[PDB]
Amino acid sequence: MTRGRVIQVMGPVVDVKFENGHLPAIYNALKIQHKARNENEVDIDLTLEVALHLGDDTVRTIAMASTDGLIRGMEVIDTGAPISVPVGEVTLGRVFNVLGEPIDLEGDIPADARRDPIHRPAPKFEELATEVEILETGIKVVDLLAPYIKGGKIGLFGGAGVGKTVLIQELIHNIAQEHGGISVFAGVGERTREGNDLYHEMKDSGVISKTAMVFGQMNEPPGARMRVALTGLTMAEYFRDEQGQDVLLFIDNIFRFTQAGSEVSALLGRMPSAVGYQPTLATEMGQLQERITSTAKGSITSIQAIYVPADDYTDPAPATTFSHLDATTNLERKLAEMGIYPAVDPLASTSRALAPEIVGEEHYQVARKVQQTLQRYKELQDIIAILGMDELSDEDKLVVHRARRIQFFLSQNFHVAEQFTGQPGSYVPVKETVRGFKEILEGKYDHLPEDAFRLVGRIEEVVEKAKAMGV
Amino acid sequence: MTRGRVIQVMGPVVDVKFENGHLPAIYNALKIQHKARNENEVDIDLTLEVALHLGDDTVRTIAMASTDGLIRGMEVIDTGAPISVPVGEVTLGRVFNVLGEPIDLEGDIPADARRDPIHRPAPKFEELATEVEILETGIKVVDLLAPYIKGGKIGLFGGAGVGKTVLIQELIHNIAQEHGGISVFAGVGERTREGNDLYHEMKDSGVISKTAMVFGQMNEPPGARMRVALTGLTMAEYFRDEQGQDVLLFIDNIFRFTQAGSEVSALLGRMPSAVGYQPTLATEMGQLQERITSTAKGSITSIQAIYVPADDYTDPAPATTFSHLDATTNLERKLAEMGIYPAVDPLASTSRALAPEIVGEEHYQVARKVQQTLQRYKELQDIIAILGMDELSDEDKLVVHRARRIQFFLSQNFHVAEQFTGQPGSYVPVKETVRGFKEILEGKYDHLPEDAFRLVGRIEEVVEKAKAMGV
Amino acid sequence: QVSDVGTVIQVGDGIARAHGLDNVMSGELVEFANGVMGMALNLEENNVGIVILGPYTGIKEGDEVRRTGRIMEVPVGEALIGRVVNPLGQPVDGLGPVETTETRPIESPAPGVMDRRSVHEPLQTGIKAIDALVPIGRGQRELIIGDRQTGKTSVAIDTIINQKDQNMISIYVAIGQKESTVRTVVETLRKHGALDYTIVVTASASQPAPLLFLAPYAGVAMGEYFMYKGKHVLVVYDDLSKQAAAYRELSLLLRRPPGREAYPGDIFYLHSRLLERAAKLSDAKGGGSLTALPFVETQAGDISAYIPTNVISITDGQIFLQSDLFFSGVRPAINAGLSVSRVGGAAQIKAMKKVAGTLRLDLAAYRELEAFAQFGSDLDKATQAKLARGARTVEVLKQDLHQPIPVEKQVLIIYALTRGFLDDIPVEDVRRFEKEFYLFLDQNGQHLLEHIRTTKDLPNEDDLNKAIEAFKKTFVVS
Numbered sequence A, B: 001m002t003r004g005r006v007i008q009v010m011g012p013v014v015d016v017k018f019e020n021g022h023l024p025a026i027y028n029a030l031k032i033q034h035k036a037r038n039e040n041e042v043d044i045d046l047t048l049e050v051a052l053h054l055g056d057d058t059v060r061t062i063a064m065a066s067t068d069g070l071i072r073g074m075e076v077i078d079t080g081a082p083i084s085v086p087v088g089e090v091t092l093g094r095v096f097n098v099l100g101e102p103i104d105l106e107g108d109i110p111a112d113a114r115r116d117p118i119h120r121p122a123p124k125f126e127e128l129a130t131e132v133e134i135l136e137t138g139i140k141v142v143d144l145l146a147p148y149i150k151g152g153k154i155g156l157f158g159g160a161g162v163g164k165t166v167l168i169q170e171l172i173h174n175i176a177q178e179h180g181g182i183s184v185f186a187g188v189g190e191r192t193r194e195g196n197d198l199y200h201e202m203k204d205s206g207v208i209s210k211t212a213m214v215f216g217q218m219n220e221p222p223g224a225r226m227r228v229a230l231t232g233l234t235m236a237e238y239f240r241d242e243q244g245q246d247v248l249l250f251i252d253n254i255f256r257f258t259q260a261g262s263e264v265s266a267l268l269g270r271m272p273s274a275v276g277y278q279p280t281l282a283t284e285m286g287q288l289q290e291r292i293t294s295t296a297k298g299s300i301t302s303i304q305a306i307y308v309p310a311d312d313y314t315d316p317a318p319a320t321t322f323s324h325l326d327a328t329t330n331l332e333r334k335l336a337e338m339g340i341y342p343a344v345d346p347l348a349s350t351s352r353a354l355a356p357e358i359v360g361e362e363h364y365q366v367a368r369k370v371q372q373t374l375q376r377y378k379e380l381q382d383i384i385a386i387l388g389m390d391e392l393s394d395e396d397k398l399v400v401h402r403a404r405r406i407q408f409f410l411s412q413n414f415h416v417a418e419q420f421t422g423q424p425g426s427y428v429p430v431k432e433t434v435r436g437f438k439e440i441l442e443g444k445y446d447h448l449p450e451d452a453f454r455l456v457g458r459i460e461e462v463v464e465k466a467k468a469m470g471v
Numbered sequence C: 001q002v003s004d005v006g007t008v009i010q011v012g013d014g015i016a017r018a019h020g021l022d023n024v025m026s027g028e029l030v031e032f033a034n035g036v037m038g039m040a041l042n043l044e045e046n047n048v049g050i051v052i053l054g055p056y057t058g059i060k061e062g063d064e065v066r067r068t069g070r071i072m073e074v075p076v077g078e079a080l081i082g083r084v085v086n087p088l089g090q091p092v093d094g095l096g097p098v099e100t101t102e103t104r105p106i107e108s109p110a111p112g113v114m115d116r117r118s119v120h121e122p123l124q125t126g127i128k129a130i131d132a133l134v135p136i137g138r139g140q141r142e143l144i145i146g147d148r149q150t151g152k153t154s155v156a157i158d159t160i161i162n163q164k165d166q167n168m169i170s171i172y173v174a175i176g177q178k179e180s181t182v183r184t185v186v187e188t189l190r191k192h193g194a195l196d197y198t199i200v201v202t203a204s205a206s207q208p209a210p211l212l213f214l215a216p217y218a219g220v221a222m223g224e225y226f227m228y229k230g231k232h233v234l235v236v237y238d239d240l241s242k243q244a245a246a247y248r249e250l251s252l253l254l255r256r257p258p259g260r261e262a263y264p265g266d267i268f269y270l271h272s273r274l275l276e277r278a279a280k281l282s283d284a285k286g287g288g289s290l291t292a293l294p295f296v297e298t299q300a301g302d303i304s305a306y307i308p309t310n311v312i313s314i315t316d317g318q319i320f321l322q323s324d325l326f327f328s329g330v331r332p333a334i335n336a337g338l339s340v341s342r343v344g345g346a347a348q349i350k351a352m353k354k355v356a357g358t359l360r361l362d363l364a365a366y367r368e369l370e371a372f373a374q375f376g377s378d379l380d381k382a383t384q385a386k387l388a389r390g391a392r393t394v395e396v397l398k399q400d401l402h403q404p405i406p407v408e409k410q411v412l413i414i415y416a417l418t419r420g421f422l423d424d425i426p427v428e429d430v431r432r433f434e435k436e437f438y439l440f441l442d443q444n445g446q447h448l449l450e451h452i453r454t455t456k457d458l459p460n461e462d463d464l465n466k467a468i469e470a471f472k473k474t475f476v477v478s
C-alpha cells in the first residue's frame, strides 16, 4: 500500500512512516487531505516535501503551510514527483504562490497544462555564454563606477531601511518597460503591502502582459519561503530554454531563502555551524545560484536584493553570496543618514565591466580618479576630526574640497522618489555623467556651494540650482 | 597471550578492543602489522598510542601515521611499554623520526641497543641543583643585555621571517665551536625544506657527529607532531643522567607543539578552552618543560623558538611559555628591515642573569647605561617628528649621536650569514663586548660615521672600516 | 559472481550511512546500486559513513551497496594539457575523450627530506613588486592572502601567462568558483595562449562537497606526474578557504566533534598534507620542481582567523593584498611591509640582488616617515629627500593589468630609479618615463639587455650611465 502515517509533528517538520520498500525519494511531494471526523478536529489540506530518510521506513518532511491541527496517525498520500509548477504562455500576467496555484482571483488553470518540476540539475560548463556588454540604467553611480552587465548576475547588498527596494523599483521603471523579452518577479520573504503596490503599479503601467509574479512572503512558513524562489526560477528557465527570449529575473531578498533554511536546519538533526547557520549553507546556495545563468539558447539577467543582518557584511550568508555575482552594489546606512541617496558605497561596489576595453579609456580613467580622491578623503577624516581642517596642506585642502562635491554629486533624484518629495526624477546618460565628473575633477566648479549638487541629474542642473539660490 | 581488535576508525583516531583483564596501560605503544591477504587489501605497518580507557574492554588510541587502509577487525600487538627510542653514542650523527627509526638512509639501529621510555616523571625537588653560571655565546646583544644561563631555558619570540631559525643555527655553530659538548636538535613541526637545508648545513660545517636530530615534519599526524619533542628530550636526558655530561636542547618551534596538542584534544572530543585551545595546555607544557633541569650528574639547557601570531603576546601558547623561561629575546620585523641583524629588540629582551652579583659590577653598569640611552633616544624621536632636531638641547643631541652608534654596534655578522651576503662571520668575547660598549659611551668614537658600525664584530674592525672609507 | 555488499540505513544532505561491508578499508571507493560512487570516511562499529560523489537523489533506504577494493585515482599524462577537467578527471569543455594511460593515487607520500635539494632558481612572475621585494623560487610555496576583489586571481593569471618562455607547466585549480567565472578565465588564458601549457581543474559551487574537498589533491597529483619526470610545474589553488568550508560541511554532517569555529580537528592535518608535497627534487631524482600558490580570503582583513593562521604557518612566505592600497591607485596592492619570503635571495638573479637591497631601505624610510606627515612638514633636507625618493619608488612599483615585464627591463628600471636618475623628474610623469625608457631600451640599448640576459649580471656602470644619460637628454617632460 502506497500510503503513510504521521508519526511526529515538531513545528514545521513532520515525520511519516511508510510500508517497507515503498518510501518516497527525496524532494517528492506528499499530500494530506483530511475532513473532520468529529467536532474536536479541523479540516486539513496541506502539502509536504521529503527531505531525509531516517531509516526504519521513516521519512522526515517539511511543511509548506501551517501545521495546526495535525494528529498522529493521519494518512499521507504520495504523489511520486516533486512540486510541479505550471509553465508556458499561461503564466504571463498571473500571480502564483509557492505551489503554482494562481492567487490573483482570476480563475483557475486547466489541469492538463504543461508543468515542470522545481528541481533540476544546473547547466554545464560547455553551454555558458561569456560575452560582457554594458546595460545602462540612468543612475549616475551605477553607470560610472560599477556598470551593470547584460546577461549577468547583479546583487544589491544593504541593511534595513537603506533604499534597497526603491532602487529595484527604479531599475524596473527604467529597464522593464523597454526589454521586449519577459520579466519574472519572485518575492521571497517580503512585505505583502509591497507586493500589492508593485502589482498595481505594473498593472497601471501595462507591462503586466509580459510578466509573471510568484509571491511567497514574510507571513508564510519556512517551506514556502524556501521554495518560492525555485518556483519562479523554473518559469524563468522555461522561457530561457524553450523559446530563447531575453528574461529579466527580479528577486527580492534572496537572503530569506538561507534564513528559512537556517530556521528548519535545527529540527532536521544537523549540527550547527559557525554562527548558528546550517552546515549545508554553501552547497544549498550554490545549487540555487548556479541555475541563474545565461546559455547559448537564451540569456537571463537577474537582480537580487540581499539583506545584510545587523549590518555585518562579514556574516556567512552575505560573505558566501559575493562569489556568485558579476556586479555588486553595497548600500550604507552611514551614507543614508547623511541625506545622500541612493546611498551607494563608492568604494565597496565593484563590477567586472569596469575595464578600459569595455567602458573606454576616458570613462575608466575618470572612474579610477574619482575612487582615488574618495579614498584620500576617507583617509584624512580622522585627523580632520581630531585637529580640524586647519592643518591640512594645500594639496589636502583641494582634495577635500573636490571630494565633498563629488560625493554630493553622486546623489540623484529618482522617479520613484517623487512619492516622498516634490522633485520629479531624472535619467542621465553615461556620456553626460562622464563629462560631468570629468569637469568636476577638472576644477571648473570650484566656487559653487556644496549643497547645490544634491539630488540633481546633469551637471547643468547644478549650475541652475546655484543660480536659483545665491549666485 | 592477548591481541587487540580494531573496532572503529575515525580518521587519525582508532579504537581497539582487548580481552578482559589484559588491557594495555595508558601511553603504551600498539603495533599494527598486516601483510595484504588479497588484491582488495593493502599492507599496513603502523603504530598507535593509548589515550583513554573507554570501558567495556575498549581503548581509545591516537595514530602516529596515516590510517588509510585499516579494516575493522585487524590484529593489534601490545608492546607493554610506552614508545621507546634508542639512546647512547649510537644516536650521534643520525636523523630520526618520532619513533626512533632513522631516516638518514645510513642504516638501521641494531636490535640489541638500549632503548628508553618516552614518558617518565620529572626529577624530584630533592635532586635539583641551583647554581648560576653564564653561558657565553659570542653574540653582542645576547652577552650584553640578555645573558644566557647554563642549565636554564631561553625563549626566542617573533613573527614570520624575522630570523629565529638562522639565530638558532648560529647558536649551534658558535657553541659547538667554543665548548665542544653534546647537543640535540628537535624539529617539532619541521618544514621539509628547512630540515633539508639544516641537515646539509650540518654536513658542511662538521658540527654533526656531535649532535642528534629528530624531525617531526608537518605532513605527519598530530600525535607524532606532539611526541617528537619528548623523543628529543629523552635522547638528551640519556646524555645528562647516564654519562654525566652537559647537553643543549634546540627546539624548532613550541607554537606547533601547542597546536598539535589542541588538535589532538579536539580529535579526542574534549571541550575547547579559551580561544579553542586544549584544556590541558598548562599541564602538557609543564610536563615538557619540567624535565629540562640541571641536577648533580649534569645540566640540560634548552633554546626554544616561539612564533607569535599577528604580534599578539596574549595568545595562550606564548602566554603559557612565558612562565618557564629564564631569559627572553624579542626579534623585530622593524629592526630586520633596517638591515640590522639579528634584529633583537634591545629593550624588550630581558634576563634574570643581568644582576650585579652574577655577571659583574662593570658589566651591569654598562648594560644599564646602554639601556637608558636607547630608551631616551626612543622617546626623543617622536618629539623630533613634530619639532625639528635643530630645536633640541645640546645634551640630548649628544644622546642621539651616541645612540646611533650603540644601536648600529649591537648588530653583528654571522657564520651562517655567508650564504646570504658573502661576508664571513665573527665571534666576540664578553669582555670585548663590555669594553667596546664602555667606549663609544665614553665618547671615544664620536667622529666616526654611523655606517662604519654596522655588522662589524670587535670594535677594532669599526676603525678598520673607517680607515678603508678614508674617514 | 559476488562481492562484499552492504545496505543503506540513512540518506540525507549528501551523506549515506550503510550497514554491513565488513571488510571495507578506510577511504575505499564504494559504489551504490544507482551507479554513483562513494567514499568511506567513517568506520564505526555497526555502520559505515559514506560520502557521496554524485547526485544523491537516486539513493533510497534499502538499496544495496557494493565494495570495489580500490583507492581513488586520477588520469595523468601529456594529453590533459590544454583541457579543462573534473576533479575525477572527466572533461567538461566538451572537446571529446581524453586518451591517457597512467593513473596516480590521490593520496601519496611527499618527497622525503633526503630527496630534496635547496631552492636556488627563480620563478619569474613579471610583477615588479613581487620579483623585487618578495621573490619566489621553484619548489617554493607562497601564500597570497587578501580581502575580496584585491587582485588575487589577476596575480595568478599574470604569473601563468609570463611562463610562456620557461619550460614550465601550469595548473590552475578552481575551487568553489562559479562556472561562468571559470569559463571567463579559460577564455582569458586562451587569448594570450597559456592553454598550450596549462591544465585547468574545476570544481564549481553546484557540485557535491566531496569534489570541492578533493580537487586540490587531483591537481597536485597531475602536477607530481610531471614533476617526477624532470619537468617543472606551477600549481595554483584558488580558495583553500572554500575547500575548508566544504570539509567542515562534511565533518559536521558526519557528526564528528567540532573544534574552534566549528572546524574539524584535522583541518590543519589536511592542509599540511596538501602543501608539503611541493618540492625541489635533487638531481639524483631528476631535478624537477613543483611550486604551489595557495589563496586564502580574509573577512575585512582579519588575518587571525583559524584557516588564515593555519595556512600562514605552513607556507614559506606570504603576499598581502589590501583594499586601502588598491583603491588609492597603488595596484598591484602588495603591502611590501607585511609581505615576507624566506627563500628570497637564492631565488633572485645577481643583477636583481644588487638593486633590491637598496630598494628595500628606500621603501622602509618612506614608510616610517609617512606616519608623521600630519604634524611635521619641511622638517629637514633629509626627510625631504627621503619623501621624494619614496614617492618615486612607489610610482615605479606600479603596473597595469595583463602586461608582464621581463627581468632585464625590471632590473634596468629599478637600477635607474635607485641610482637617482629619476630625482629630477616630476612624480606625476614616472609612468610615462618608464614606458619611453622601455621603448628606448628596445630600440638602442640591445647590447645591455643581451648582456643581462646572458650573464645574469649588470652591465658595466659606465655604459649603463651613458645609456641612461642619452635617454634623459631626449626625454621630454610635461
Ligand SMILES: Nc1ncnc2c1ncn2[C@@H]1O[C@H](COP(=O)(O)OP(=O)(O)OP(=O)(O)O)[C@@H](O)[C@H]1O
Binding pocket: A158, A159, A160, A161, A162, A163, A164, A165, A166, A167, A341, A342, A414, A417, A420
Ligand atoms: N532614492 C531615494 N530617495 C529618497 N528617499 C529614499 C531613496 N532611497 C531610499 N529612500 C528612503 O529610504 C526608505 C527605504 O525604503 P526601501 O523599502 O527601499 O528600503 P529597504 O532597504 O528595502 O528596507 P527594508 O529592509 O525595510 O525592506 C524609503 O522608504 C525612503 O524613505
Ligand SMILES: Nc1ncnc2c1ncn2[C@@H]1O[C@H](COP(=O)(O)OP(=O)(O)OP(=O)(O)O)[C@@H](O)[C@H]1O
Binding pocket: A351, A352, A354, C147, C148, C149, C150, C151, C152, C153, C154, C155, C331, C332, C399, C400, C401
Ligand atoms: N593591476 C591591476 N590593474 C587594474 N585592474 C586590476 C589590477 N589587478 C586587478 N584588477 C581588477 O580588479 C578587479 C578584481 O580583481 P581580481 O578579480 O583579480 O581579484 P580577486 O581577489 O581574485 O577577486 P574575487 O574575490 O572576486 O575572485 C578586476 O576587475 C580586475 O580586472
Ligand SMILES: Nc1ncnc2c1ncn2[C@@H]1O[C@H](COP(=O)(O)OP(=O)(O)O)[C@@H](O)[C@H]1O
Binding pocket: B158, B159, B160, B161, B162, B163, B164, B165, B166, B167, B341, B342, B413, B414, B417, B420, B421, C341, C342, C343, C344, C345
Ligand atoms: N644575519 C643575517 N644576515 C642576513 N640575512 C638574514 C640574517 N638572519 C636572517 N636573515 C634573513 O632571514 C631569512 C630566514 O629567516 P628565518 O630565520 O627563517 O626567520 P624565521 O625562522 O623567524 O621565519 C633569510 O632568507 C635571510 O635573508
Ligand SMILES: [Mg+2]
Binding pocket: A164, A165
Ligand atoms: Mg526592502
Ligand SMILES: [Mg+2]
Binding pocket: B164, B165
Ligand atoms: Mg623558522
Ligand SMILES: [Mg+2]
Binding pocket: C152, C153, C154
Ligand atoms: Mg578572483
